[PDB]
Motif scaffolding. Structure first.
Motif, short mmCIF file in Angstrom:
data_model
loop_
_atom_site.label_atom_id
_atom_site.label_comp_id
_atom_site.label_asym_id
_atom_site.label_seq_id
_atom_site.Cartn_x
_atom_site.Cartn_y
_atom_site.Cartn_z
N UNK B 198 0.85 -1.19 0.00
CA UNK B 198 0.00 0.00 0.00
C UNK B 198 0.89 1.24 0.00
N UNK B 199 2.00 1.16 0.72
CA UNK B 199 2.95 2.25 0.78
C UNK B 199 3.61 2.46 -0.57
N UNK B 200 3.97 1.36 -1.22
CA UNK B 200 4.64 1.40 -2.51
C UNK B 200 3.78 1.84 -3.69
N UNK B 201 2.53 1.38 -3.73
CA UNK B 201 1.63 1.68 -4.84
C UNK B 201 0.63 2.79 -4.59
N UNK B 202 0.21 2.93 -3.34
CA UNK B 202 -0.80 3.91 -3.01
C UNK B 202 -2.12 3.15 -3.08
N UNK B 203 -3.08 3.54 -2.26
CA UNK B 203 -4.37 2.86 -2.24
C UNK B 203 -5.02 2.81 -3.63
N UNK B 204 -4.75 3.81 -4.47
CA UNK B 204 -5.31 3.83 -5.81
C UNK B 204 -4.96 2.59 -6.60
N UNK B 205 -3.66 2.41 -6.83
CA UNK B 205 -3.14 1.26 -7.59
C UNK B 205 -3.59 -0.06 -6.97
N UNK B 206 -3.63 -0.11 -5.64
CA UNK B 206 -4.04 -1.33 -4.95
C UNK B 206 -5.43 -1.74 -5.43
N UNK B 207 -6.39 -0.83 -5.33
CA UNK B 207 -7.75 -1.11 -5.75
C UNK B 207 -7.81 -1.43 -7.25
N UNK B 208 -7.05 -0.66 -8.02
CA UNK B 208 -7.00 -0.82 -9.47
C UNK B 208 -6.61 -2.25 -9.86
N UNK B 209 -5.69 -2.84 -9.11
CA UNK B 209 -5.22 -4.20 -9.37
C UNK B 209 -6.05 -5.30 -8.74
N UNK B 210 -6.62 -5.05 -7.57
CA UNK B 210 -7.44 -6.07 -6.92
C UNK B 210 -8.59 -6.37 -7.88
N UNK B 211 -9.12 -5.30 -8.47
CA UNK B 211 -10.21 -5.40 -9.43
C UNK B 211 -9.85 -6.13 -10.73
N UNK B 212 -8.79 -5.73 -11.41
CA UNK B 212 -8.44 -6.41 -12.65
C UNK B 212 -8.06 -7.87 -12.39
N UNK B 213 -7.56 -8.16 -11.20
CA UNK B 213 -7.20 -9.53 -10.85
C UNK B 213 -8.48 -10.34 -10.64
N UNK B 214 -9.40 -9.80 -9.84
CA UNK B 214 -10.65 -10.47 -9.52
C UNK B 214 -11.75 -10.39 -10.58
#
Ligand SMILES: [Mn+2]
Ligand SMILES: [Mn+2]
Ligand SMILES: [Mn+2]
Lengths: 314, 314, 314
Positions: B198-214
Motif C-alpha cells: 500500500x505504501x509502494x503503490x498507493x491505495x489507488x493502484x491497490x484497488x485498481x489491481x485487486x479489481x483487474x485480478x478479480x
C-alpha cells in the motif's frame, strides 16, 4: 512585490461568534514579525472597523444580509486600493463570507485572476439552496457569472457583480458538500479535487493538474482562498465546521509551496480560525500556528531550508 | 437492490468478550436510520439468538468448537435465505469467526463470488497451526478448497464445505501475520496487499489491481469482509488486536468508495468492533462512528457530495 | 553476517541530558532478545565507558570539544574492530555527535561506503556556522572531504580525517534546516529528499532514486544513520528536537524494509531516543518501541510476514 496584511474581524456569516478574534490570535502568534524576515516587504494595514447595521431583518432565510454586504463592500474597496498600488493582499478572516469582498476587490485590478479554493466545503449555496441562511456557505454563489440572476437580489449586495466563471475556480479538499451544492458544481462543470481524488492521485498530481488547467494557455494572477478547515481536525481543531479525513499538515504545506513556485500569488485569505472553539489552549495554539506556517510557506519559506543570496556562509 | 441488516452478536471466537455488543453499539449510533436516507431499501432483520452449547470440550487446542460451528450454521442459513430473495446482506459482528457463516450462506446463492478481506491479519490459521485455539484466526482456513483435508474434522463444522479457491480472495492491509499463515498464503499463491504494498503503490493502484485480478475476465459478486482493525488504532481503537501502522480513515473510505463504483457489492461484514475495549468513551464513539461511515460509503455516500436525480435544486 | 550491538550512552553533543539513557531503554524494551529470533547472529558488546574530560573549555562557541572528541575516537576504534571481524555494527546512541565515531570507524574497513541520513535535520553546521556550539548539529561537517580546512581545528578531533564526499550522502526527511546549512548542502550539491520531495514522489520513488543514485554504477556498503526525530512527533515524541510534519511509522518502516532488500546494510545508528523527555510514560514507550521496530525491519522482519526456510508448516 510588497505585502499588505488586512484584518477582517467579522463573523456575521455564521451563528456563533469567535471568528472575529481570528486576526488577533494570528497577529499575537507573531505572524507579521515572522513575515518580515522573508524576502518580502510587509505592511500591516490593521483591522477594518465594521459597523453593525441596525434592524437587519432576515431576507427570507438569509441572515444578517445588510451587515455582511456592508462589510464586504468596505473590504473590497480596501483590497482593490492596495492591489492598485501593486501590492499582494493578505486578508485574515473572519468567516468565509468575507471571501466575497476579498476576491471582488482583487478582480477590479486583475479581472483575469483564478481562484484556488482549499476548503472541506464548496460554499456555493445560493439564498435559495441554503439549509440555513448563514452566509459563510454562499460566498462563491455571489461571484460566479453563471449564477447571475439564478437567485433574488439580497439587501446589501447590490454593489456585487459576478467576477469569475466556472472555468476559473478549482476546489481542493472537498469532503462536506450539500446535495444542492453538488448539483451546482456538477451542472456548471467546475474542476474540483475532493479527498477521493487526492487519495487517488496524491497531492503532487493534484497541484500538477490544477496548474495546467488554470495556467494552461495564459499565466494569470492566482487568488488563494484558504479555509483552515481544509486540513484534518487533528491539525486545525479550532474552526466552525471541522470534518474528519482532511488534508494533512504536509499536504497543506506542499500546496502553498507549489503556489509560491509559480510566482503568481496575488491574493491570499486565511479564514475560519476561531480561537474560542478550541477544546484546550493547546488546540488553539496548534490551529493558529499551522495557519502561520501556511502563510510563511506561501511567501518563500521552504521545508528544505532557505538562505540569503550573494551571502557566503563558509 | 434492497439491503438486509443481520446482527451476529457472537464472541466465542476469542477469549474475552465485548464483541457481542458490537451490533448494539452500531445500531445505537444510528446505522439503520442513516442507511435509510440513501438510494437503498433497508430492512433490519434483528439479532440472531445464539445458544450456548453445554460442555463444549476444547477440540485438542481449538476452543468452543460446537458453539462457533452451531452459530455459523445458523447464520449461513439466514444469509443464504435473504440472498435467495435478491437482497444484499450486511452482517454486524461479532468476531471474525462469523465470517465462515456469512461467506458460506452467501456462496450457496452465488458460488462465483470473490472475497476482498480488509484486515491487519490473514486469519488463515488451521486447527493445527493456531498458537491459540481461538477460532477468530481461522475463518479463511475453513473456506479454502485447497485446504480441504489438510486438518482434522472439528466438532460442529461438519456442515461446512470449502467454497472458495486461493484465486478468489484478496487481502488488504496485512501487517500481523503468523509464520504458519505466511507459509500458507505463499505456498497457495494468494494475492495480497500488505502495508508495504500500500505504501509502494498507493491505495489507488491497490484497488485498481485487486479489481483487474478479480473482475478480470468475468464480473462476479463481491463479498467484502471488513475487520475494523484494518485501520490504524488511532481511528478504530476499540478492537481485540489493534496493530500500529494501519490504513488511514481516508484509505478506508477510498476502498469502500471504489467497491460501490463497481456496483457488484453483494455481501458486507463489519466485524470486530468491541465497545468494552475503548480506553475512554470517546475512543468507542470514534470506532463505532468510523464503522458507520465505512458502511454508508459502501452504499452510495461519496465525499464529493450526493444529491437526488431528477430534482432541480436551483 | 553476524550483528554486533554497541552502546554509546553519550549526551555531551547537546545541552540537556537524557540521551545517555537511550541504550538502556532500548535494551530494556527487549531489543537484543527480539533480534536473536531473526536469521542473524547477535552479540551485545555492552556499553562503552566514557570518561569526562576535566576543564573542557568551550572552543570559541563549540561546547564540550575534548569530551565529544575523546568519546568519538574511542567509538571509532570499537566500530572499526568489529567491522574488521566481518560483523555489522549497530550503535545505540546517544546524540548525533556519536555519528562521527560510528561512520569513521566504519570507513576504516569499508572506505567506499555510502551514508543514508534519515533525520529532520541536516546537522551539517561547522564550528563557524553553529548558532550554538552544540556538536550534535555538526557531525556531517567533520566527515565531508569538501569541508576540509573550511573551519579551524577543534580540540579533540585531531584524529578525524574526512572520509566521505558530497556525492556519497543522501538525506531523507529534512524539515528543519539552518540558512548556513542550506547554503552548504546547496553549494556542495548534496542529494537530499526533504518532506516536500517525499510528498511529491511518495516514499517509494524516494527510495528508488536514493538507490540508483548511490548504488548506481557499483554496489557498495550502506551505512544507515537513523535519527529518531525523522518520524513525526506523534510517533517518536521523546527526543531533543521534534519537528511536526515528519515521516510516518509506515514510511519509516518502508525505508528500512528497502534497505534490507539490497542486502548491503553494513552499519546502523539508532540515535536521539531520550527517555526523560517523554511527557507521559506512554510517550516514552511509544518512542522506544518504534525504534525497536525500525531495527528489526532492517534485519529481515517484513510486514507481510516471515517464516523459516526448509520448514513445512502444513
Ligand atoms: Mn469550510
Ligand atoms: Mn483482524
Ligand atoms: Mn535530528
Amino acid at each position: 512585490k510588497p505585502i499588505e496584511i488586512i484584518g477582517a474581524p467579522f463573523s456575521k456569516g455564521q451563528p456563533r461568534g469567535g471568528v472575529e478574534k481570528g486576526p488577533a490570535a494570528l497577529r499575537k502568534a507573531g505572524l507579521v514579525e515572522k513575515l518580515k524576515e522573508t524576502e518580502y516587504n510587509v505592511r500591516d494595514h490593521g483591522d477594518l472597523a465594521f459597523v453593525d447595521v441596525p434592524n437587519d431583518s432576515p431576507f427570507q432565510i438569509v441572515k444578517n444580509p445588510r451587515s455582511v454586504g456592508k462589510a464586504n463592500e468596505q473590504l473590497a474597496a480596501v483590497v482593490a486600493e492596495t492591489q492598485k498600488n501593486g501590492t499582494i493582499s493578505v486578508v485574515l478572516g473572519g468567516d468565509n463570507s468575507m471571501a466575497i469582498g476579498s476576491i471582488s476587490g482583487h478582480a477590479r485590478v486583475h479581472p483575469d485572476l483564478c481562484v484556488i479554493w482549499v476548503d472541506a466545503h464548496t460554499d456555493i449555496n445560493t439564498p435559495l439552496t441554503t439549509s440555513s441562511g448563514n452566509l459563510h456557505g454562499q460566498p462563491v454563489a455571489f461571484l460566479l457569472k453563471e449564477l447571475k440572476g439564478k437567485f433574488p437580489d439580497v439587501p446589501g449586495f447590490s454593489w456585487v457583480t459576478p467576477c469569475i466563471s466556472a472555468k476559473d475556480i478549482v476546489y481542493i479538499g472537498l469532503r462536506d458538500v450539500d446535495p444542492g451544492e453538488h448539483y451546482i458544481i456538477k451542472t456548471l462543470g467546475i474542476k474540483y479535487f475532493s479527498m477521493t481524488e487526492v487519495d487517488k492521485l496524491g497531492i503532487g498530481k493534484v497541484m500538477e493538474e490544477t496548474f495546467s488547467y488554470l495556467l494552461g494557455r495564459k499565466k494569470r494572477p492566482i487568488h488563494l482562498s484558504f479555509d483552515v478547515d481544509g486540513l484534518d481536525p487533528v491539525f486545525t481543531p479550532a474552526t466552525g465546521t471541522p470534518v474528519v479525513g482532511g488534508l494533512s499538515y504536509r499536504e497543506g504545506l506542499y500546496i502553498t509551496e507549489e503556489i509560491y513556485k509559480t510566482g503568481l500569488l496575488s491574493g491570499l485569505d486565511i479564514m475560519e480560525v476561531n480561537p474560542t472553539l478550541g477544546k484546550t489552549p493547546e488546540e488553539v495554539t496548534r490551529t493558529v500556528n499551522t495557519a502561520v506556517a501556511l502563510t510563511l510557506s506561501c511567501f518563500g519559506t521552504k521545508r528544505e531550508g532557505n538562505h540569503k543570496p550573494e551571502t557566503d556562509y563558509l
